[PDB]
XYZ file of C-alpha atoms in Angstrom:
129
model
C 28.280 -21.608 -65.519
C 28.812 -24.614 -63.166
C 25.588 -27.260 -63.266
C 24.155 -29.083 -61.194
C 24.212 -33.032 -61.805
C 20.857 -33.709 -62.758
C 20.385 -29.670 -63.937
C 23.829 -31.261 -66.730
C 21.764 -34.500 -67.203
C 18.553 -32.809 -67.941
C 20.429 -29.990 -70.210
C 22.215 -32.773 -72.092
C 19.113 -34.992 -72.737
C 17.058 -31.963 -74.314
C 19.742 -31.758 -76.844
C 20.042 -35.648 -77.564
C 22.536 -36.752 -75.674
C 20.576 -39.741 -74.332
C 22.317 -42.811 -75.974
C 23.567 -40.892 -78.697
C 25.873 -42.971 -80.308
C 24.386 -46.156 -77.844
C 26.071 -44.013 -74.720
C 23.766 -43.440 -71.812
C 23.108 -40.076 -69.817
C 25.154 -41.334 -67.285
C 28.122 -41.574 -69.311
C 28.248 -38.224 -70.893
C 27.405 -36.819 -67.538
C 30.418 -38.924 -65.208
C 32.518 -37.595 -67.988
C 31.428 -33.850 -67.872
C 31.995 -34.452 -63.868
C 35.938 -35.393 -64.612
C 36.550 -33.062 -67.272
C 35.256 -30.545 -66.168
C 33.445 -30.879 -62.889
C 30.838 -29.653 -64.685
C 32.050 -25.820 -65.396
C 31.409 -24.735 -68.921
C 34.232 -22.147 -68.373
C 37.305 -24.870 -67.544
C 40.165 -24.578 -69.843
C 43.221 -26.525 -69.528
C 46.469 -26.226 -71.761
C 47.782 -29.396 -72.862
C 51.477 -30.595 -73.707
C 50.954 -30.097 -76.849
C 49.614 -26.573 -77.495
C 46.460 -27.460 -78.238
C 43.846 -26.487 -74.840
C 40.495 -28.177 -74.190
C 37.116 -26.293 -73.729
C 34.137 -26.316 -71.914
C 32.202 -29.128 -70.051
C 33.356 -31.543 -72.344
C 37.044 -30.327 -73.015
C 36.429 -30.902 -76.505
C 40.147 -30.249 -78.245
C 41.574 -27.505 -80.440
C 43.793 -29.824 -81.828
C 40.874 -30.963 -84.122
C 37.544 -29.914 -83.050
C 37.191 -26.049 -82.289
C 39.459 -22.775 -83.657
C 41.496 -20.924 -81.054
C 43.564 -19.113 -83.218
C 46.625 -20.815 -81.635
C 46.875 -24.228 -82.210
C 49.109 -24.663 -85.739
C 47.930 -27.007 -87.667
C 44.405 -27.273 -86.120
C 41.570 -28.292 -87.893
C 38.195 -27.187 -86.764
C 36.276 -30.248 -87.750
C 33.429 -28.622 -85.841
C 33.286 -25.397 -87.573
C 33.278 -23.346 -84.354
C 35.041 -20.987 -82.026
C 36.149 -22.567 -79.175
C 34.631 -20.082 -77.298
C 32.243 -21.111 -78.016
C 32.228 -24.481 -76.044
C 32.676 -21.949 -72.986
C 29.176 -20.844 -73.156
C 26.487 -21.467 -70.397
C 24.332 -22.751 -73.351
C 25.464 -26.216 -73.959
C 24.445 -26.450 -77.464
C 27.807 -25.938 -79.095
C 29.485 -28.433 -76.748
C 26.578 -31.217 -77.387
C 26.872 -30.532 -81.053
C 30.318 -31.560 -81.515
C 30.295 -33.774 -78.682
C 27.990 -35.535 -81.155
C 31.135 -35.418 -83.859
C 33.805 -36.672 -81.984
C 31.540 -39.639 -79.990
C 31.094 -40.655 -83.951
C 34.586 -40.507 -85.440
C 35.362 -44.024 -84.783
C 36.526 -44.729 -81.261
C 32.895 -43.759 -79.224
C 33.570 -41.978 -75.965
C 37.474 -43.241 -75.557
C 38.111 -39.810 -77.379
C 37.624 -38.270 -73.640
C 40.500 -39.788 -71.768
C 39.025 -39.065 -68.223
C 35.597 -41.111 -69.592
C 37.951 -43.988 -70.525
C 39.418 -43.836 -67.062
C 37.140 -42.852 -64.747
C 33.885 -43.808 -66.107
C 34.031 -46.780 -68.650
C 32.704 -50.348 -66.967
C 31.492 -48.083 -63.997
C 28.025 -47.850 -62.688
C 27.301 -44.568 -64.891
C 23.706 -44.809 -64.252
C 24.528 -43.760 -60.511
C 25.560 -40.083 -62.007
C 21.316 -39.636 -62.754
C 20.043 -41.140 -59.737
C 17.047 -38.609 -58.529
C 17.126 -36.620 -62.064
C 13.548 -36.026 -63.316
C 11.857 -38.710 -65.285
């Protein structure tokens, strides 16, 4: 399913996004705009092998089993189907993982580019208090 803006804000704060990890709404939604453009169905292959799911692009390489990614991990302990689902639950979860590894929200590239040091808070203007 593709979300609205504030429909993804409101979707991720019921399931704790909201400066989990110190990151505000706006940053976990700018960075479901430029990973995904908010489509829990995107998929995109990378150099690698390894392809990234769902709203988030959260990474076989380490996070989600695809069958078909040697030497994957599944640190998440899910399909990666699952991250395709129109419930976001499975993407917030392990969202939630990788945001607390170490490194915070660099672990999306695009949020790092696109989003980091940017007025985040603009991606919520007019959501529902």
């Amino acid at each position: 399913k593709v979300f609205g803006r504030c429909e993804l804000a409101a979707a991720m704060k019921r399931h704790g996004l909201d400066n989990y990890r110190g990151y505000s709404l706006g940053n976990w939604v700018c960075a479901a705009k430029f990973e995904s453009n908010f489509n829990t169905q995107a998929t995109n292959r990378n150099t690698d092998g390894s392809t990234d799911y769902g709203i988030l692009q959260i990474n076989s390489r380490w996070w989600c089993n695809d069958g078909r990614t040697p030497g994957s991990r599944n640190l998440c302990n899910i399909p990666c189907s699952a991250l395709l689902s129109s419930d976001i639950t499975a993407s917030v979860n392990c969202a939630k993982k990788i945001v607390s590894d170490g490194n915070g929200m660099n672990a999306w590239v695009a949020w790092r580019n696109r989003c980091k040091g940017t007025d985040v808070q603009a991606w919520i203007r007019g959501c529902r208090l």
